[PDB]
Ligand binder design. Structure first.
Ligand SMILES: CCCCCCCCCCCCCCCCCC(=O)OC[C@H](CO[C@@H]1O[C@H](CO[C@H]2O[C@H](CO)[C@H](O)[C@H](O)[C@H]2O)[C@H](O)[C@H](O)[C@H]1O)OC(=O)CCCCCCCCCCCCCCCCC
Ligand code: CLA
Ligand code: CLA
Ligand code: CLA
Ligand code: CLA
Ligand code: CLA
Ligand code: CLA
Ligand SMILES: CCCCCCCCCCCCCCCCCC(=O)OC[C@H](CO[C@@H]1O[C@H](CO)[C@H](O)[C@H](O)[C@H]1O)OC(=O)CCCCCCCCCCCCCCCCC
Ligand SMILES: CCCCCCCCCCCCCCCC(=O)OC[C@H](COP(=O)(O)OC[C@@H](O)CO)OC(=O)CCCCCCCCCCCCCCC
Ligand SMILES: CC1=C(/C=C/C(C)=C/C=C/C(C)=C/C=C/C=C(C)/C=C/C=C(C)/C=C/C2=C(C)CCCC2(C)C)C(C)(C)CCC1
Ligand SMILES: CC1=C(/C=C/C(C)=C/C=C/C(C)=C\C=C/C=C(C)/C=C/C=C(C)/C=C/C2=C(C)CCCC2(C)C)C(C)(C)CCC1
Lengths: 154, 733, 97, 80, 42, 66, 193
């Protein structure tokens, strides 16, 4: 397939890893009781392992000769769940944080003692500003067209 | 004067030991000596160049003479794969008998050293066969050393010293260096290959006493003038040839095949002769550009002044750069060092993937040694290329004469350059270290399937475009009917595709997640070293914390503790900080190369591919695992021939640590200690009858930094060299 | 194919072009570029003995001013063209459509 | 002996002369400032180069400057 | 009491609270949707 | 007729060795007596590296901004 | 105006033949750039106006399309054919040399003039019937020439893009393919394959 990687459903190495880890867990299990709390913890971990391997099977990830999952970030459309849509999520959240921070900085810059509001936050003001990040993209766009994002004469 | 040193009167009147130290470390900075002219500076540098040339010839003379005298060459030529080449003999009176027995190898009659420079393979490749050739060459090199010295002397008297404006004729020098120094030399080397080495690898021994009587081709110089050059490639060496024999030999002298020689896993000799001829033609034609005494050609200054884009986005363009470059020697040296550094690591990258010498790809230790040597020298050359830019900005830069051209414009937005370099290096560091730590944690918890393993799909794509068929991309040279594969299928594409698709050479090794991560670490290193050096250069004329820095020189301790404190504010200090990052970066690069290759040479590539993605893998499976033989070189039960490396390994660890002292402890503490000692001595009987002549003092601040850095990097190089050689030589595989 | 035929054909064409088509454009570009200068003066007027133009052989009895140097330059242009033509016309190389 | 130079931006606050540990500096009369005062450096053969004067100057940028130069016995602060 | 409200908004306390809440949020997310390597939704 | 910018004006600094160079400050006093080479006294919004917030300037190092 | 309701450039008033106020990239913000650009525009327009009949006519005839007609050259025994007759001097190298010499001579001749009104409208030995009689029908002819030239350039680039979409086709084969099923053979099939 892409870069020679075959699917984790069809990968024998992927399966081998799954069953090796599972029965290593279950060899560590055969102790303490068949019902004591340690046994219950170990069985929960076994079930979580099965869920993890099966989910990676469902999601159509690519495996190599190692038997572990690989990531395709080229832009191919069968793999946007790997990098590009979590990347869009990240860029949105990051811009949110930074936009709120810059608007707070601007809001307090005209105070007589601006440093007093830097080391001691004005929490009601920030509470009014937190939710503008929700539309930070549109605002930042109309602030770029306005000639309003970049400090003139710097 | 009236004292050492003569060049500085200010140092000569220094009554402390400082006078001696600084006397030595200022001896070649000619621009800082008393009564210096332009002519004296230029003439000193010319004679110094001649001295360095003599040095190089004497050193290569020594190597030739010593392997011809105490060496192994003759037996090595009979079986290059089953004998170890000798460097020279050991005579050490502190030796005990078991060490005497331990170091006696290679068939010698006493203790010797094995060579790893690779000179047996290189000299064998170009034609030398018996000890008389090596003796001959050594004597000729001695002669050329003496002639170099004679010219150096001759060009220092009157009646023979050139003028400053002879040295400032740039068009003349470039014409000669392009068509004479690069073109004629490459033509004569193509000649040596066609006349001596191509026959040498076919059984015949052409030498000075018979070469006028042996044709290099069956129809000598006929084809060349009649025009049909193709006859020179009409019968290549068959692909079952044995190097220094006639079995399977052809007659061609120039080819274009692409592949390797099947037996030696090396480049064809005919390919290299043809390459040198081609580039010599290019250089000769291109060395006729600029104008001289004959009324045709180009003025460099006019080309530079005519290149200004309308719309004024580059300001005044390049107007006035000819005189900025022609009048500054530090500018020219920075340019020279930058170009030479880039092509030095290009040498490193091309000599391991496309070996030129026969039976050198099968000598693993020489491969690793050569690669590490050339990469480290390239790194030092880069740091110097950037240092002389800051020296140029301080000393020789003239603002009003460069008004509004590209250079002053660089100075005008230094904040935007430094800020973006800073952003880039922050980004790379954050994400690279973050993914490595993610992976390490994932494996500590027993879940290696939870790793983040990004696949380098762009480098895999570029490898496909060169004809690799391991990733099924089917692009240029890897597709079926594309014009790229179609237009070259007849000449070099067979050999190239045959070599690139073999998986026991080093031509485009397979890559995976580990390669991705370490390549981003390499990018981080390059960006951060560039940030340090560029900031040091662009801030050397002054900053906001010290706006008059240019009035203080390239190197000075500080500006005292005022204004918050100014430790390490000179541009010399930026260089000193950048050397650490250079060493770290070359470390990452060479660790990558050596681990990948040592697992490939063992048929255990999956080991690297699995352990390279988390840092515990690097620490345990590369550093710890490959150290056993070296550190067992000597032990309570005896010593073997790894002893000298087991010793050296520790030397490097010691020197390094001593460098920490000079770097962490600073001057005042030591000066007070020394005052105490001076009292003690002056007060003791039978010993105060002895009087020093220089008052002892602690070292200087800049001096202490330099001495610490020297210890640090000496320790660095020595420990890594010992480990690399002992861990490849111990396996010899 | 016939070497000297092609050789002198390419050479004569190059020299004719140099003397009758580009001779003006070339002289104008050489005039406007001029002699190389260091610090405002030419290389001779700063004290370089060996960097003085060769006025003696440059002068010529041509009606327009063709001399030995133009002949050398353009003639070898023609020679390089002739050799490229010869080599690739006898090299047997063939791409494919 | 180091070099010490006084520049005409001096406001004549005398803070540099009070700080010198070897008595290099001095106040002299002037006419270019409200204080009619200016610093001078008549005794630079005794300067140890501590820059204690520069830490004391309030003008922007400095009005007293110390350029470290050739070293002697007095300049190095040697008692032996 | 007002002085306490001010003190609680001094930098170290504010950051402590902000990050403890953020930590609880990410911890609970990962306790509900464990071992995520991709965006499996759309 | 007095000299220089008005008291409490907004001026831009042109002395490139200054910390506040190409920034702005507010005039507070302009020494009218000639024989002073730096009459204008400017107070700034931020302190420099020496923890100082006011400095004297000449008449041409100061340019009135609006 | 090229965009009703869009302010004109200051340096483009509307007197030049073809000025409709179109220069969104301000590449003609320098006058001595704009003069060269006018001469350059006319040269390109004239080459394309001569070319597109040379691309359409022989394909409408019983000959091969503009790409097919230049394919003997990439084979060793190449030999051209005009109107179905084997060109005697048809081999490649003679053609390359002759093309070079002739084109170089005429193009340098063009470069050696400095009017700069002659650079775009020399006339004389190039205006036989003397259509430069009257300066008012003259300006009209200039506008019609430049307008047809911009149309011709549009059509030549259209030919090239349709070529790279359907390799091994001609323009008239494209027109036939489109008249054979108008609602089904259109650009959509090469923009959403
Ligand atoms: C989707 C279709 C239907 C949507 C219907 C949604 C209804 C709301 C439901 C849930 C929203 C949850 C969060 C509510 C905000 C918390 C209260 C607050 O402190 O938020 C209050 C602020 C106040 O809004 C504006 O705030 C501005 C800033 O003022 C002040 O803001 C602060 C207020 O504390 C300080 O007083 C500070 O000194 C000062 O900067 C101006 O005062 C404006 O006049 C004022 O209108 O935002 C606001 O109204 C709240 C903005 C919420 C928008 C969220 C959109 C969805 C995500
Ligand atoms: C292992 C040692 C080490 C490390 C990690 C660094 C790291 C760094 N150096 Mg440095 N350096 C070192 C040794 C080191 N150096 C030495 C020995 C020298 C010679 C004196 C230098 C000299 C030097 C210079 C001159 C410069 C740097 C620069 C930098 C920064 C480069 C930008 C970057 O990569 O982004 C970030 C990379 C990182 C690795 C940061 C890692 C730390 C993360 C954020 C930990 C996260 C904290 C976490 C939440 C828990 C906190 C715990 C809590 C108790 C606080 C970076 C932070 C350059 C710079 O400043 O760039 C702008 C620069 O100019 N270095
Ligand atoms: C054809 C005429 C000619 C020639 C041959 C030279 C030759 C030389 N000149 Mg000179 N020069 C000339 C004319 C000429 N010059 C004129 C007319 C002027 C006046 C304008 C000057 C002014 C001048 C000055 C002022 C200086 C020189 C210098 C030099 C020396 C350069 C240093 C060196 O040897 O490195 C060797 C360089 C090469 C061999 C070519 C570069 C090779 C590249 C970088 C890579 C090689 C690739 C290959 C893989 C290497 C193989 C490795 C393997 C064998 C191990 C060199 C021998 C310097 C000097 O003389 O030092 C004493 C110097 O100071 N020249
Ligand atoms: C600078 C490098 C160099 C040098 C010094 C020589 C030197 C020599 N070559 Mg030679 N050669 C070289 C490169 C070189 N070669 C290369 C790169 C090739 C591959 C094309 C050859 C291939 C070659 C062949 C096939 C032959 C020689 C021969 C010779 C010898 C006689 C040359 C002669 O008289 O021809 C005549 C010279 C001219 C007609 C004038 C040359 C015009 C120049 C450009 C001016 C001579 C000692 C001949 C020989 O018999 O050796 C004894 C022989 O036949 N060479
Ligand atoms: C062709 C290359 C070249 C040339 C001609 C020069 C020339 C010059 N350099 Mg330069 N430089 C270069 C490359 C070069 N450099 C490179 C590659 C670097 C990066 C390392 C530098 C970095 C550099 C700096 C930072 C400085 C110079 C300076 C200078 C000037 C005076 C140097 C001097 O004599 O001080 C004296 C020479 C020494 C003190 C060398 C002795 C100490 C060395 C480092 C110890 C050697 C290690 C040890 C002995 C070996 C191992 C020990 C053993 C156990 C094996 C001079 C004009 C200095 C200057 O004056 O500014 C203009 C300056 O400060 N250079
Ligand atoms: C491995 C690194 C290293 C080494 C070797 C030393 C060594 C030394 N330190 Mg130091 N130190 C270090 C790291 C190191 N330090 C670091 C990182 C720091 C920063 C915190 C300091 C901070 C520090 C301070 C503050 C002080 C010292 C002091 C001393 C000296 C102690 C007196 C002594 O033991 O004499 C004996 C010498 C040795 C043990 C060195 C080894 C001796 C060798 C093996 C002898 C070989 C001789 C050989 C044949 C020479 C001939 C070779 C020929 C080619 C020339 C000593 C020379 C103290 C001092 O000066 O005491 C008076 C002092 O106060 N150190
Ligand atoms: C740049 C470095 C980096 C990166 C890119 C990652 C990335 C990731 N880590 Mg990791 N980690 C790192 C550093 C890093 N880590 C370091 C340095 C450590 C050591 C302290 C760890 C230790 C670590 C552990 C122990 C685990 C991870 C896990 C994960 C995965 C979690 C996915 C997730 O949270 O679901 C989704 C989360 C969200 C969608 C949050 C966004 C929702 C917001 C709050 C709502 C907004 C709505 C509008 C993810 C791919 C987990 C995993 O599953 O591994 C496979 C996990 O077990 N990491
Ligand atoms: C791809 C993802 C990003 C897309 C961004 C969309 C295009 C943004 C370009 C338009 C911004 C712009 O023109 O403003 C340009 C902004 C300055 O903003 C300008 O300010 C002027 C004076 O107030 C005018 O108001 C202009 O209309 C205004 O655009 O600066 C720049 O980005 C540099 C471009 C040239 C100026
Ligand atoms: C194989 C030999 C290796 C050396 C080749 C290099 C020599 C050829 C070029 C030299 C040009 C001399 C320029 C005039 C310089 C000159 O001759 O001027 C004479 C010099 C006086 O100095 P000046 O007043 O001329 O100083 C002006 C300076 O700016 C010029 O450099 O007096 C001395 O000889 C001091 C001797 C100290 C010797 C110190 C010992 C250093 C040991 C190593 C020395 C080199 C050996 C290298 C081997 C590793
Ligand atoms: C500071 C300073 C200085 C110095 C500087 C430096 C040091 C720089 C550098 C730099 C560098 C270090 C650079 C580099 C570079 C590189 C480049 C620029 C490249 C390239 C190329 C290309 C583009 C390629 C292409 C290709 C081919 C050819 C084929 C194959 C494919 C490819 C694509 C690859 C000086 C003195 C000057 C001045 C003063 C200041
Ligand atoms: C007298 C006269 C005349 C005549 C003229 C003539 C006859 C001419 C000429 C001329 C010529 C006829 C010239 C030539 C030539 C030159 C040159 C200068 C050359 C060259 C070449 C080169 C330089 C190179 C070569 C090569 C080599 C060596 C190697 C391989 C290949 C090659 C190609 C690279 C007439 C009547 C018309 C007119 C009047 C006057």
């Amino acid at each position: 397939d892409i870069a020679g990687l075959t699917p984790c459903k069809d990968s024998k190495q992927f399966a081998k890893r799954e069953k090796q880890s599972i029965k290593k867990l279950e060899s560590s299990l055969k102790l303490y009781a068949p019902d004591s709390a340690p046994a219950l913890a170990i069985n929960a971990t076994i079930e979580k392992t099965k869920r993890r391997f099966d989910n990676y099977g469902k999601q159509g990830l690519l495996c190599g000769a190692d038997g572990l999952p690989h990531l395709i970030v080229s832009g191919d459309q069968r793999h946007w769940g790997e990098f590009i849509t979590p990347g869009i999520l990240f860029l949105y959240i990051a811009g949110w944080i930074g936009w709120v921070g810059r608007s707070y900085l601007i809001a307090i810059r005209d105070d007589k003692k601006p440093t007093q509001k830097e080391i001691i936050i004005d929490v009601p003001l920030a509470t009014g500003l937190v939710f503008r990040g929700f539309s930070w993209p549109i605002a930042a766009y109309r602030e770029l067209l306005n000639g309003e994002l970049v400090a003139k004469d710097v | 004067a009236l004292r050492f040193p003569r060049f500085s009167q200010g140092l000569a009147q220094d009554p402390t030991t400082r006078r001696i130290w600084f006397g030595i470390a200022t001896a070649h900075d000619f621009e800082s000596h008393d009564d210096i002219t332009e002519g004296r500076l230029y003439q000193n540098i010319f004679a110094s160049h001649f001295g360095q040339l003599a040095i190089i010839f004497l050193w290569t003379s020594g190597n030739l003479f010593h392997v011809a005298w105490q060496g192994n060459f003759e037996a090595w030529v009979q079986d290059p794969l089953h004998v170890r080449p000798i460097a020279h003999a050991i005579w050490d009176p502190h030796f005990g008998q078991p060490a005497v027995e331990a170091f006696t190898r290679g068939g010698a009659l006493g203790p010797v050293n094995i060579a790893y420079s690779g000179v047996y393979q290189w000299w064998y490749t170009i034609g030398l066969r018996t000890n008389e050739d090596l003796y001959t060459g050594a004597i000729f090199l001695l002669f050329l050393s003496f002639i170099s010295l004679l010219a150096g002397w001759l060009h220092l008297q009157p009646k023979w010293k050139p003028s400053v404006s002879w040295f400032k004729n740039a068009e003349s020098r470039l014409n000669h260096h392009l068509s004479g120094l690069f073109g004629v030399s490459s033509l004569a080397w193509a000649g040596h290959l066609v006349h001596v080495a191509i026959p040498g690898s076919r059984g015949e021994y052409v030498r000075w006493n018979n070469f006028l009587s042996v044709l290099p081709h069956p129809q000598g110089l006929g084809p060349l003038f009649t025009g049909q050059w193709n006859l020179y490639a009409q019968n290549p060496d068959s692909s079952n040839h044995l190097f220094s024999t006639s079995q399977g030999a052809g007659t061609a002298i120039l080819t274009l095949l692409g592949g390797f020689h099947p037996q030696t896993q090396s480049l064809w000799l005919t390919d290299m002769a043809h390459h040198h001829l081609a580039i010599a033609i290019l250089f000769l034609i291109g060395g006729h550009m600029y104008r001289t005494n004959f009324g045709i050609g180009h003025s460099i200054k006019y080309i530079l002044e005519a290149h200004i884009p309308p719309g004024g986005r580059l300001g005044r363009g390049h107007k006035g750069l000819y005189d900025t470059i022609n009048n500054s020697i530090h500018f020219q040296l920075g340019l020279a060092l930058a170009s030479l550094g880039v092509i030095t690591s290009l040498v490193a990258q091309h000599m391991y993937s496309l070996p030129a010498y026969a039976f050198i790809a099968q000598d693993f230790t020489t491969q690793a040694a050569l690669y590490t040597h050339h990469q480290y020298i390239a790194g030092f050359i880069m740091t110097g290329a950037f240092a002389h830019g800051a020296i140029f900005f301080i000393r020789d830069y003239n603002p009003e004469q460069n008004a509004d051209n590209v250079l002053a414009r660089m100075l005008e937005h230094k904040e935007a350059i430094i800020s973006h370099l800073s952003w880039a290096s922050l980004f790379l560091g954050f994400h690279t270290l973050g993914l490595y730590v993610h992976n390490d944690v994932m494996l500590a918890f027993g879940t290696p399937e939870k790793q983040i393993l990004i696949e380098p799909i762009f480098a895999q794509w570029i490898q496909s475009a060169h004809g690799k068929t391991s990733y099924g991309f089917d692009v240029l040279l890897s597709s079926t009917n594309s014009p790229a594969l179609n237009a070259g299928r007849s000449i070099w594409l067979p050999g190239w595709l045959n070599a690139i698709n073999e998986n026991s050479n080093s031509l485009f090794l397979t890559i995976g997640p580990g390669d991705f991560l370490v390549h981003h670490a390499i990018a981080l290193g390059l960006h951060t070293t560039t940030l340090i050096l560029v900031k040091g250069a662009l801030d050397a004329r002054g900053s906001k914390l010290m706006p008059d820095k240019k009035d203080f020189g390239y190197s000075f301790p500080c500006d005292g503790p005022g204004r918050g404190g100014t430790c390490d504010i000179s541009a010399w200090d930026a260089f000193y900080l950048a050397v650490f990052w250079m060493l770290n970066t070359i470390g990452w690069v060479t660790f990558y190369w050596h681990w990948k290759h040592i697992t490939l040479w063992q048929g255990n590539v999956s080991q690297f591919n699995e352990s390279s993605t988390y840092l515990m893998g690097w620490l345990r499976d590369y550093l710890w695992l490959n150290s056993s033989q070296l550190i067992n070189g000597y032990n309570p039960f005896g010593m073997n021939s790894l002893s000298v490396w087991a010793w050296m390994f520790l030397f490097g660890h010691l020197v390094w640590a001593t460098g920490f002292m000079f770097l962490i402890s600073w001057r005042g503490y030591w000066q007070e200690l020394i005052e105490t000692l001076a009292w003690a001595h002056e007060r003791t009987p039978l010993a105060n009858l002895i009087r020093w002549r220089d008052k002892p003092v602690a070292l200087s601040i800049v001096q202490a930094r330099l001495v610490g850095l020297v210890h640090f990097s000496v320790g660095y190089i020595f420990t890594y060299a010992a480990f690399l050689i002992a861990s490849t030589s111990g396996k010899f595989g | 194919l016939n070497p000297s035929l092609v050789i002198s054909l390419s050479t004569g064409l190059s020299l004719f072009l140099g003397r009758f088509v580009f001779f003006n454009f070339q002289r104008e570009n050489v005039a406007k570029q001029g002699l190389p200068e260091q610090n405002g003066v030419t290389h001779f007027e700063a004290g370089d003995t060996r960097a003085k133009e060769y006025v003696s052989l440059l002068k010529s009895n041509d009606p327009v001013g063709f001399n030995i140097v133009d002949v050398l330059a353009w003639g070898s242009i023609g020679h390089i063209v002739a050799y490229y033509i010869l080599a690739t016309s006898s090299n047997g190389y063939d791409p494919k459509f | 002996s180091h070099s010490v130079k006084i520049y005409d931006t001096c406001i004549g606050c005398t803070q540099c002369v009070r700080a010198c540990p070897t008595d290099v500096l001095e106040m002299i009369p002037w006419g270019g400032c409200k204080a009619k005062q200016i610093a001078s450096a008549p005794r630079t053969e005794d300067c140890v180069g501590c820059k204690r004067c520069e830490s004391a100057c309030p003008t922007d940028f400095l009005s007293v400057r110390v350029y470290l130069w050739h070293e002697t016995t007095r300049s190095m602060g040697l008692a032996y | 009491m007002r002085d306490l409200k001010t003190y609680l908004s001094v930098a170290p306390v504010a950051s402590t609270l902000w990050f403890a809440a953020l930590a609880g949020l990410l911890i609970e997310i990962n306790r509900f949707f464990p071992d995520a390597l991709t965006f499996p939704f759309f | 007729p007095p000299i220089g910018p008005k008291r409490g004006a907004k001026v831009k600094i042109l002395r490139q060795e200054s910390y506040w160079y190409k920034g702005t400050g507010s005039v507070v006093a302009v020494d009218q007596d000639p024989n002073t080479r730096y009459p204008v006294v400017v107070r700034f919004n931020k302190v420099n590296y020496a923890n100082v917030s006011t400095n004297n300037y000449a008449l041409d190092e100061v340019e009135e901004v609006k | 105006d090229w965009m009703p309701g869009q302010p004109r450039p200051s340096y483009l008033d509307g007197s030049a033949p073809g000025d409709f106020g179109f220069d969104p990239l301000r590449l003609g913000e320098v006058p001595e750039n704009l003069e060269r650009f006018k001469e350059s525009e006319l040269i390109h327009c004239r080459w394309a106006m001569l070319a597109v009949p040379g691309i359409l006519v022989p394909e409408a005839l019983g000959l091969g399309n503009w790409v097919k007609a230049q394919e003997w050259a990439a084979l060793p025994g190449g030999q051209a054919t005009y109107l179905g007759n084997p060109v005697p001097w048809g081999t490649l190298p003679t053609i390359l040399v002759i093309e070079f010499l002739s084109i170089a001579f005429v193009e340098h001749q063009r470069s050696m003039e400095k009017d700069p009104e002659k650079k775009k409208y020399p006339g004389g030995a190039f205006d036989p019937l003397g259509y430069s009689k009257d300066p008012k029908k003259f300006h009209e002819y200039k506008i019609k020439e430049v307008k047809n030239g911009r149309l011709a350039l549009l059509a030549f680039v259209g030919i090239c893009v349709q070529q790279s979409a359907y390799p091994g086709t001609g323009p008239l084969e494209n027109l036939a393919t489109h008249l054979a099923d108008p609602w089904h053979n259109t650009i959509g099939n090469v923009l959403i394959p």
